[PDB]
Ligand binder design. Structure first.
Ligand SMILES: CCO[C@@H]1C[C@@H]2CN(C(=O)[C@@H](NC(=O)[C@H](C)NC)C3CCC(F)(F)CC3)[C@H](C(=O)N[C@@H]3CCOc4ccccc43)CN2C1
Ligand SMILES: [Zn+2]
Length: 95
């Protein structure tokens, strides 16, 4: 079937609902994370992408979830369709 890792998390609205217990101390906001395909897994500040199942943690002030998505998980289909291969190639070219 579908390549999507977590079908229940395919909508922005559903991803946002997972952030009810997101610690307010974390400098990155639920809106920025959910927009970039991430949902909260309920431990610390751990998030996973609904499409590629890539996990990120230890968010710091000034982190851009889209940039982090492209840095670590460049072949994610959701990332490529939302931001484009040109964006992914640019981020990848920094490393
Ligand atoms: C073999 C290839 O490994 C790459 C490295 C990259 C780092 N990363 C991360 O999440 C990194 N986070 C960041 O870069 C954050 C978003 N900005 C500072 C790590 C930065 C150093 C640290 F010590 F703080 C720990 C977080 C992710 C990560 O550590 N994810 C963990 C491990 C796998 O399981 C989960 C599950 C949920 C959430 C996170 C993770 C994915 N990693 C792949
Ligand atoms: Zn992804």
């Amino acid at each position: 079937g579908s390549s999507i890792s977590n079908l229940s998390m395919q909508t922005h609205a559903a991803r946002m609902r997972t952030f009810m217990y997101w610690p307010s101390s974390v400098p990155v906001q639920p809106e920025q994370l959910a927009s970039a395909g991430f949902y909260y897994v309920g431990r610390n500040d751990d998030v996973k992408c609904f499409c590629c199942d890539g996990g990120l943690r230890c968010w710091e002030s000034g982190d851009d979830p889209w940039v982090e998505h492209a840095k670590w998980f460049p072949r994610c289909e959701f990332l490529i369709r939302m931001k484009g291969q040109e964006f992914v190639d640019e981020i990848q070219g920094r490393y």
